[PDB]
Ligand binder design. Structure first.
Ligand code: FAD
Length: 309
């Protein structure tokens, strides 16, 4: 059974909120919870951060929140820190199904000297550590929401959505999939195919795995889920197993879906994209197709959605 959500008036707007709060006057939100998403063998920490915005900073799935960490801009004395953007990992109703909270999926950026391995905290990422170090009741300066690239196309409730994530790039897809499958949204009844491909370092680095596995058992004809574990698996050519290698295992199914009008999404660190492009080119070549021409048509048809960072 789908989970009741409120308030239904969040469905009424016909345009997404944008820049409701700006950097000079952010919204002072409050941390609800911070929890690690990863096991002890993960190379670094990734946390789920729940933020109470009280309904003052609503958003649509696929958008980002800005966070202004405290302190001074190290490059402009007297000025605030620059905004850092984070893909919202929750639906518009949020993890408490009430329209009052939104969630972030935040990897700690930690610096290690390339030769000695010595950590240097002064070179760690300011906003990501600020967020992962936060505790219930702490205040967060929120801006936005912002972004339109990753809004979910809902005009066809039976569309196909192929979602390609590495690491924290899973965030918008957690939101899409909760709206598609878990929440009782009477004006969006999804009857298409949602297919999540996720690449992470190892099993302990998986994010939200139990939630996604649950969708396989509840919606076996509408959801597919495939994972690539780069430090624990090898591809067919002998390289470390990346998300593009999982795509290749389903070369024919995914190309057929794209030809049929499927939307395809990419999110996570930008270093994910070169290997993906290389694989898609090789898959097309084996089929006797030009990947350049196919990608041009996907962009012209508004099927191609990329937000990497
Ligand atoms: C649209 C969008 C969505 C995003 N979504 C997410 C998301 O869902 N989750 C997420 O985790 N991130 C996400 N990001 C990235 C996020 O915005 C930040 O860039 C990231 O968290 C790092 O910010 P920071 O403040 O921690 O690091 P910063 O302080 O900005 O530092 C940047 C990097 O430089 C390194 N560094 C600092 N000083 C030195 C030095 N002297 N020498 C060498 N290295 C140094 C830091 O360790 C860090 O890796 C997103 C970005 C965009 C644009």
């Amino acid at each position: 059974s789908k989970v009741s959500v409120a308030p239904l008036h969040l469905e009424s707007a016909k345009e997404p909120p944008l820049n409701t709060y700006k950097p000079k006057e952010p919204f002072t939100a409050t941390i609800v919870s911070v929890e690690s998403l990863v096991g002890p063998k993960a190379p670094g920490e990734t946390c789920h951060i729940v933020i109470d915005h009280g309904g003052n900073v609503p958003y649509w799935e696929g958008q980002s929140y800005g966070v202004i960490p405290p302190g001074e801009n190290p490059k402009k004395p007297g000025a605030p820190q620059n905004v850092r953007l984070y893909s919202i990992a929750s639906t518009r109703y949020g993890d408490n199904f009430d329209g009052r909270t939104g969630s972030l999926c935040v990897a700690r950026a930690v610096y290690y000297d390339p030769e000695t391995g010595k950590e240097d905290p002064s070179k760690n990422g300011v906003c990501s550590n600020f967020l992962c170090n936060s505790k219930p009741g702490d205040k967060i300066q929120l801006t936005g929401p912002s972004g339109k690239i990753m809004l979910l196309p809902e005009e066809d409730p039976n569309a196909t959505h192929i979602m390609i994530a590495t690491g924290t790039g899973v965030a918008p897809f957690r939101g899409y999939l909760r709206r598609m499958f878990m929440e009782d949204v009477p004006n969006y009844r999804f009857g298409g195919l949602a297919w999540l491909f996720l690449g992470v370092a190892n099993s302990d680095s998986l994010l939200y795995d139990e939630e996604f596995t649950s969708y396989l058992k509840q919606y076996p004809d509408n959801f597919r889920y495939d994972k690539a574990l780069s430090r624990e698996q090898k591809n067919r050519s002998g390289g470390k197993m990346y998300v593009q290698d999982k795509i290749e295992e389903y070369s024919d199914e995914i190309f057929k879906l794209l030809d049929g009008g499927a939307h395809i999404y990419f999110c996570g660190l930008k270093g994910m994209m070169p290997g993906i492009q290389d694989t898609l080119k090789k898959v097309a070549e084996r089929r006797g197709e030009s990947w350049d021409q196919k990608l041009a048509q996907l962009k012209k048809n508004k099927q191609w959605h990329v937000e990497v960072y």
